[PDB]
Design a protein around this ligand. Structure first.
Ligand SMILES: Nc1ncnc2c1ncn2[C@@H]1O[C@H](C[C@H](CC[C@H](N)C(=O)NCCc2ccc(O)cc2)CNCc2ccccc2)[C@@H](O)[C@H]1O
Lengths: 330, 330, 329, 330, 329, 328
């Protein structure tokens, strides 16, 4: 069901129209030509092949382009029509289940999901290091998740407006009221995907770093992100906002791709997890806690956020379902 | 304070734009020309004087046009510009307080309000019979208020949609939830003024008649309307719908002005009093009870509607303030 | 995985907002009170349980409300909070797998999908007849699929315009052109879910009836619909439009729920399947061919349409995937 | 019986949906926490109590929340349900008549009406300084009215289109013409409440400041606003536009709430006073005069505007009734 | 006028009056002996439709005359329908062209608004120079009807529109001085639309023209006296006009009526408003004259003078039939 | 021809374009030193609105020429606004009357659909025989803009609307022989209405007429070359037209635009279809010419020809601007 989605050219078209992402990848690869020139490359989850073509443009000798959806057939068509069949080898299948005839010098991929970790494609990316030669590189090389507390009364009250549909005593004779709390909980469990004005942020971001050269596939099963924010503004904290940056650390240039709200919009937007019970904070208070991601059987994570205002002892605890994201952007 | 808003020509313009009303009054008067020809007329609440002009067109000898608001000054200007100062005498003040130099053959007025009785102007109209000669007439002569049970899921649910604004636990940090019930109650206490399709009615209307020629002021202080509806459709009864007809019973013809939902729309629309607890009825059931209007000090009535489905014993008891209608029409 | 979608109250809220559908069902049930009064009822795929509450309003003795998704848990909460545990028993699971304690007098459901047959829920509905007493009834009792030829130059050309991205000869140094034909093919294979003005229909519709009391589950594995349209307007025929009507044939009255473009809009909208290549026809001409639906493993059908103008003999076909509809509304 | 309509939760809900207003008040209070922390506070015309709740969020020891309408009963319910009985005391009645057992450190209120002064609530706000310590503050602290000449052909001509309803010689046989000029005068006497594009303003605004810490209740009975505009565009001046800003001058930050047409729209919109006789001005001309506001018994003001182009001597004098605004925004 | 008639989009619009076309067909077909083997002149044939009806009734020769370039399209239609032996299209004005042969019957649709507009009836009468002794004419006679009406909404509309000019500063310009002239202009326009018969205040009066007897010159000055017996009281806002024609064949008489009690035609009905309305009591008498004088622009200058005999109130009105207001929507 | 302009109802309708009226008033009032104590000529004044604006800017004297019986209403307005000294109404066509004084500036609204319809620009230019060598014209220049568009619905309507003519037995008559001619007729109608800018497939090309420099005879034959760089792939169904004018004063230049990106005016925009649509890919070039030849009926015969340069594919049409189709 995950991979069927990706078999449609309508879907590929949509994915290729992120010009920030595509330009940044092309630059990371082309400006680090000595990391590709005459090298063996693995492209994990190539779709229609775009990153593999960039690797070929940078002079790679062979690129193994692995794709688990029927999009592999279309990649094969483009490889031939662009006269690169000697240089890009399309491999249908999951990177966990295919065979490479050869170890590689560098792995390239776009494994980032919403909040960095959605899709659990980072685990596939890390799994693929079994094909990596000693002292081989990975593009992207490291990933930083950023989180910061926000206030947004409008977003917060939206959840109740929607749930209150159920708070009526005679819907064609039926009293729906008993489901209102369940509706509220469900909406608050959905991470909210859209952008926002940076003015809603109440403290400087905290980060959590994954070095993909060092990290092990298993490490991503249980991710514990601690935080201690020093509040720069007084107000109601309605949740945490998330974005991420990744770096392509080449031998010539380090290139960054950012999905920060201070940067041009990408197809990852930003993500906000709401607290059903908001926390009041004054300037100078400290908002501490932990965000815990546990991998689930649906290409996703269960999210647990507990935060407290240290100076008052008010706590808020929040469970979210990263497999039911709410796409709010317009 | 009550008559202030009637002093404005913008408001007079709006009232004159009901062409169903204006045209029906003109027909009733002109077609009953022998009821006006060389007679003395009293116009109760003449506004800018339009009904008095109609009486004049039908050949009245003299018309005393009584007006409580500053609109009286504007009527006097129209009378003069229409070269009728000899035949229409504008008397500023309440019909209960002014003096007429003589008795009249016929009284004409537009005393009907929402649900017929709102404004308590019917009492002013009846009071004015102290000026009426024996066997004089009144136009309108009788009025029939009709009530029928309706179903309307959208209108009913709208009340909770609006009250649920208060059902939120952190409106800028404030828990508003405790006011939800009071907000619901307030909305249901407002009779709804708008129109509707006749297919929402669930039984044939019951009526209650006032003969303006025989009735006295005292009969309008406590208005008791029993009802027994034979339900023609099964479903949820959300309230009673109200409209009214008046007849101008002249010597030549009887002309009706109807505000029913089967008839062209007037500025009275129709009125619906909702039940906060709807009643389930099957076709063939009997919905019985009492609509009781008690006159109050704000030119209106305290409404009490008590209804029950006889076969099931489910009951609904409802209090409404006709002083504060919700104008819903768009 | 399929049923996970249905477990969300947001989705249920969206579904409940089809007031044409809900009001018609309530009417069908309440006006046919003798088909429910003191009867045993099966509600197939009850969601939050609304149809079951209607059967209870009509006086049913006992209603078994079967729901495959976790929405069953919410249905249960509503039955308890509405003081109806006496009369409605919620059974979590598919209707094909659960056990009921007794046979029933009437089955009620909303098994219709896009183009009537999508979801293959009609099969689950027919399957539920193993619980039905002899001379028991079903609500809906019959369903008619309707098809008619349409002209819509905007819709047809969109299929190519949407593929324009693929013409790029240098998308960051990559020629995408070789995939443009495939993008176009893919788009043409999507049935189009939206509504339209009836002025685009070039002939009175042809129908196909499924009688839910007579039909067997297996009859819906291969559905063959022939047509011969008599054209009432001249023009280009870009494809076939589909909608459906169901009838609740009660002892007291027959109530119809229609999704025709002449009736108020429902959450099923209407569906249009394009021909690869449009066909010209003049008023008075006839258009004939067949529509074949074959059930697949993804809760849907492969649709084959072949049609021709009888006079000129212009031929067009298409093979569409009802599992990948385009929601154009 | 001015306060009747404020006792309705439906009215309170409408008022509470001005999010610019609510957010700006909360920010002003929370960022100036030291002006509230452990202090005594008076809230004048608290309605449902929202500002009192913000003052409690900022750490106030005791808040006296005064409210003249039956909304006072609903505030008391919110105080109980938000667990603040020990800190917020609701006092039903007019601030001019109630007893307070204690002097206060700060007064908070939303006394502003259309054109700043409508409602005459500013007088009540100033009246309440009898409770304010000499060291105390008021939120808001100052208010600035801004006025500027505008051109708007469509607005100007609409008044005549409306009045021309009366310019007809046989409305069911009646010549209505003699009322046309009175209708025109009536429409021009109504200040227009709605918004507009700033491109209609023909000169930079002039302002008139009221310092709520300095002013006396009595200074608001007669308000004389002199103006002199240096015209920046040639054209016809159809009247004066008005808006207002208030500043909350805290010991920590000064926060502004603006109702300017360059700013996000509030429930005060902007107000335009039309000239029945427009004034022609060239760029570089000076348009001078006075706007005089005289308080009246209807909780409003009689407005007099006298304007001249200094270079040509072309004059315009206009009288308006702020008690009868026309709400044009749709 | 003839430029306008040259367009096929205009022809299409003209041909879509089904009441008119059907009635002309029944008149011609049902009087088949009036046509069977006869010589026909068709005055102003357009694309030729009436000539085709005459052929269908078995006429031997039909001379179809048309002044616009639509005559070229009529020629095409005749050839394509293989009727060149029996229908001869002659391009030009019937006044000026040549016919080889005298004819048994003339057919035409010479009726305009209020019957007389276009003055095409003078071309129809002029054509009789080609008519044999004992020849016929379809239509044979025409009746115009007039009746007083009351319509507050229509009346007041004229002032609402004219009151645009009643303002003292339209971008600095006082427009007021033109309000009276605008009012007069609107009241000079006959109003083309339909209405409910309940607005009529007296039984109609009629004026008849016998096309067999009448000469071209009889229509330069048309004087229509009237005396109405007012059946209802109210304000008389003007006169409503309509017409009937009869086709008097030897087998049957067929009527085409444009009355407000009859199915709508493309002529609708016409109302001439009175700027000063007249108050009438039931039983009063409204008398006066409607006078039509021919003008250079294919039309008439209209004068209506009316008074209520019992009160002496008079209303005098001038109208321009060359600038009708098409109000029908 | 001018008869329909004689009616106040038609003048009311024209006065309701507030974008037009406001822009002209701004042009004039902001350039007050161009009018102050000057002599002005107003070509086709109608009820006289622009002449009043020149008066507001302080003009000494304004000659307002009007060819229809609207001239009588203008003189009424002039007199009622107490301006009979300053504004002189001259009934007649400006080409058929003499004026008593040279002028410092000519004001007019000579633009028609596609800028040129009505041929009133020739009248505007003709009036330059009274303009002093140093004088100005308001508007001073006019740019007609064209761009290729895609609109399959508009294309198909030309055929659909002719379906009436297919019928082989309309009351026993076969109409089929006329359907072709019916289609050709609809095709020759330029289409007046508005549309979404998203239908445009390339950036516009312009053709400028400078009113200070042009001669009347220059407008008898107008050739407009174009080369479009296509920004989108797909079918080109025709060319869209609109126009801008500039009032180039000594103080400010004010533009009045009828573009589909601007608020709608009573000129709307105009579209002319090709008989057959052309396919082009993004990056292709679409080149051709629009040729306008003035005709006897105050209009133009329009010839449009286009080709895709990379493929040699061609279409064209010949349109009649005297018979536009008002679609809006
Ligand atoms: N002297 C007084 N003493 C006590 N109690 C008073 C006094 N004067 C006014 N009270 C009360 O005070 C309240 C009005 C407060 C202020 C209303 C404010 N001036 C406003 O929005 N004016 C524009 C809307 C409008 C109003 C009237 C009108 O004719 C036209 C337009 C509400 N503040 C607190 C607040 C803040 C945010 C959200 C909601 C509320 C009412 O409840 C009055 O009963």
């Amino acid at each position: 069901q995950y991979f069927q989605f990706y078999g449609y050219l309508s879907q590929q078209q949509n994915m290729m129209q992120d010009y920030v992402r595509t330009g940044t990848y092309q630059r990371a690869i082309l400006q680090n030509h000595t990391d590709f020139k005459d090298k063996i490359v693995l492209d994990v989850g190539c779709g229609s092949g775009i990153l593999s073509f960039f690797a070929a443009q940078a002079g790679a000798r062979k690129i193994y382009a692995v794709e688990a959806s029927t999009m592999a057939q279309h990649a094969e068509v483009l490889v031939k029509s662009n006269n690169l069949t000697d240089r890009i080898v399309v491999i249908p299948g999951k990177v966990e289940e295919v065979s490479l005839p050869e170890q590689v010098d560098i792995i390239i991929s776009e494994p980032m999901g919403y909040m960095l970790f959605n899709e659990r494609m980072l685990e596939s990316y890390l799994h693929a290091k079994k094909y990596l030669k000693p002292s081989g590189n990975m593009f992207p090389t490291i990933g930083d998740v950023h989180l910061a507390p926000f206030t947004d009364e409008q977003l917060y009250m939206e959840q109740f407006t929607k749930a209150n549909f159920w708070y009526q005593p005679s819907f064609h004779g039926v009293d729906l009221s008993a489901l209102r709390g369940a509706a509220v909980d469900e909406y608050f469990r959905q991470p909210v995907v859209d952008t926002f004005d940076i003015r809603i942020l109440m403290a400087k971001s905290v980060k959590y770093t994954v070095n993909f050269l060092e990290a092990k596939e298993g490490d991503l099963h249980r991710i514990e992100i601690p935080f201690k924010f020093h509040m720069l503004h007084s107000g109601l904290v309605h949740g945490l906002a998330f974005w991420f940056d990744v770096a392509f650390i080449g031998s010539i240039m380090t290139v960054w791709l950012s999905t920060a709200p201070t940067e041009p919009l990408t197809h990852w937007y930003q993500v906000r997890c709401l607290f059903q019970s908001p926390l009041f904070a004054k300037a100078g208070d400290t908002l501490s806690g932990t965000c815990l991601l546990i991998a689930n059987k649906r290409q996703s994570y269960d999210i647990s956020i507990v935060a407290q205002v240290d100076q008052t002892g008010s706590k808020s605890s929040n469970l979210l379902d990263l497999k039911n994201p709410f796409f709010r952007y317009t």
